[model samples]
Target: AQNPVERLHEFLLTGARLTPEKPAVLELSGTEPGYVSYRQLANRAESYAAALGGLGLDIGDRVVLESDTSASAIAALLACSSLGLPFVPVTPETPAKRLLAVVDTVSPALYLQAEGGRREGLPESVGTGRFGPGGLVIERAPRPGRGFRREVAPADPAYMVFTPKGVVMSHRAILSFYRGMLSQGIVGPESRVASTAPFQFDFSLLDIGLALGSGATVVPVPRALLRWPRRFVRFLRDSEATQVNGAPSIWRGALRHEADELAALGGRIRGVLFSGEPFPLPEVRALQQALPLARIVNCFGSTESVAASFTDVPRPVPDGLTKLSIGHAHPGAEMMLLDDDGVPVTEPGVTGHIHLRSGSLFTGYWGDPEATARALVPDPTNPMTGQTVFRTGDLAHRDATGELYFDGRADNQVKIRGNRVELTEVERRVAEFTGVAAASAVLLPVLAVFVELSPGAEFDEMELGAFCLEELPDYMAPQRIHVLDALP
Candidate 1:
């Protein structure tokens, strides 16, 4: 890719010129059950951008987008990108306290709320809402006026996303032109993608930017349909979507819809991408069976990296391969395994901390340089390598085949009862043996394993325990095994 900003400009111009009448975006209405199109999308985004610029917001200023997934939400994000302002999107379901915590960190120049009303307890000077029937309504703070333009640098901050709970509080800001290019490559012309993940989620990048950059139509799935598997599958089939992106959890949920129906709709789904967390083998197999013709890709990337890191194509697992690999690094990105002292470890089967140096790496956390310094460090082993590497904090090892195997979070490794414990190791073993789709081992001072069984598999705790005891070492075995129909 030339430059992210230039690529975005080109995409927008192409949409305006060649496909002015094409349906670029179809916003799924949770309340009404209909959709909006590309012409409307362009107009609304332009209007919103003009409105924000008219209010004197400067280019590159941070804007907080607090809302659910809606037509206005999509327009607002486009408006920010178009106007050269980096938009920070947060889930509307986020608690006010958590929202405030983010605000305290970012201190955005403007705040765009979805609902058109005054929100109490918010800072008095903060901008409120962009009120309209189906478009954004701009409310500016009482600050000096300045002009916003469509000019942006490739290394400028594009987004800021917080890591979820149980994960480290790492914030990501997209600062690469290469990411946009990679997206353009994956999504070609005439593609129609359906986005099920919410705007707040990181995987939405594939759903939003990839679709638009390639002049592909994006149909945003309704949250209501997301909760109903049958209806959601029907929506995908009816939409004739060419591509879809989500996590393994979401796909597993969709299996609740009839297999025959999904199998019948398989031809239409050309690509199915999964991300956010580790993929389970059984779920991958099920998807392969259901969508026989669709290309299944297991995508792995953190928010800091703009979801442009790696993709593992679905293949039959070789015997004795315990942990699932996250796949190779994306073009223009470098992946290295460094020992505890920050020295690069090249020997196969040797465990080390995962480090990445990529053009898509974030500019750093919002306002925490200390956190940034800790995560983004100089490449110690490669002094000539000018790129700063982002330490992933993940412990992994590469096999003799040069394929990387994820072990677990470096912080999660501990000694329990004089035995070295890696929770992911246990999870991987159980998932392999018991038709388990996904398993998570959480150390609660005492070992407890939570396993999500594959569809059509019965959850018998006693049988599961017996299976674990027979295969696993007594010390490595989970003290308790709990079967769950689904993850919360």
Candidate 2:
């Protein structure tokens, strides 16, 4: 599959040409899921690309997409792949001000919204709109002639996603991720994946990459339905979903936060993937008991290097085990542990930073040269001055078996139930809200805030937690607030 994958568009064409009649995407409805066949999926993408080219967009132009999920959104993404257009997708919940901040980084040629997108900072279009998803409107330059095609290579930046950082990923990096999934048996042409993550979350690419590269069926499991246990359970069964991807939070949510009765999976599900955050042992055990037939996959990596390691937890895990390892590096991915001085860690039980080198490594942070250099650094063990690798801020230790165990963060960053949370970033917001003398946020033992109030200041713990949820995303919000007389 990788032989012909110099660009992402080839994967789009490969899936369509190989399985023209098979369903490429299945969008769940009330009783039946709406289908988009391989051929139809490709043609729809062609139309979107044509409309984009018609707008006078040259190669490398940017298209910023803001929406939850849609056939149109998928089409736009593929069209971007095929036309050498860099696409940026943001969540529908992004605040108007936040969206504006992201838009400035790309200076996109057009902004497209699939459904109910905020039109706050955007100037209202003055004339008749050209084309897009239903109720969608857009602005443009001029349309080029039909059947326009732009060739793109592996090294070209394909997508730019905004995390706490703005991550720029090239076609080569994306293809490497798709290839990694293929090596793990995570996907194939007959496979069906019900996606739990929205586009905004980097993990959602599990479904998108597989669908485009190997003809897997991409099924949508909307986040709204996830809030309702019965409704989400119904989607899992009705969609005949065979494979699933989610963070521990989403998986834990499906258990009605009770964390299983997944026997509702009815044996049709074969792959159960958990990533983004560590899985609570109880949660995994409950799921293993409920869905005995499903292979439990532990995927580990950052967006900067997607799914660097994948491990299938053994069924009937050996007795006396306390934790599940993230597993060894996948094909084409390499990792090593380094001490504080950049010296390699050679003994078991000794912890160090994880330095990862892989074809899937991201290009860099968009426009932030200082931040870019901070994350991607020189290879810890390499003698060559030119060799490079990403220095994941996470720390881990190895056992005698060479399996790595996550210890703790080397920085303020932590994964809260699978989503990356920058503690200091949240602390800043909490500081502003309470007018406290100082504020600190810690993520691992559960997201909590510790603060010192001004000598005469008063604040409600409950109100502050609520305020954080409103101002930031759920994962970034504090679950508990600790008001201290002074810092400990």
Candidate 1 segments exceeding 4 Å error: 1-14, 28-40, 115-121, 131-133, 139-142, 145-151, 164-185, 315-323, 384-386, 413-488
Candidate 2 to truth, TM: 0.88
- For each candidate, the alpha-carbon lDDT, in order, equals 0.66, 0.74
lDDT of 2 by residue, 1-488 (tens): 54666777676567677778888777544456578887877887887776665566667766777766555667778887777887788777776756776776666666777644445565332111223433234453433323344657678888888864678889999888888777876766787888888787677765677655667888877878867766777778877888887876666565545334467684788887877777777778777777778888888888897668888887867667777887778888877899999999899999989998888988999888888888888676874877778989988898899888878689888766455778888988888875588888875457888999977887888778777766687668787788898886
Give the winner by lDDT: 2
Model 1 RMSD vs true structure? 10.6
Q: Give each model's clash number.
A: 2, 5
Worst 10 residues of 2 by lDDT: 123-132
For candidate 1, write residues 187-263 as lDDT tens digits. 56677777877676656655666676667787777667767777888888877788887766677666655677778
What is the lDDT for 294 in model 1? 77
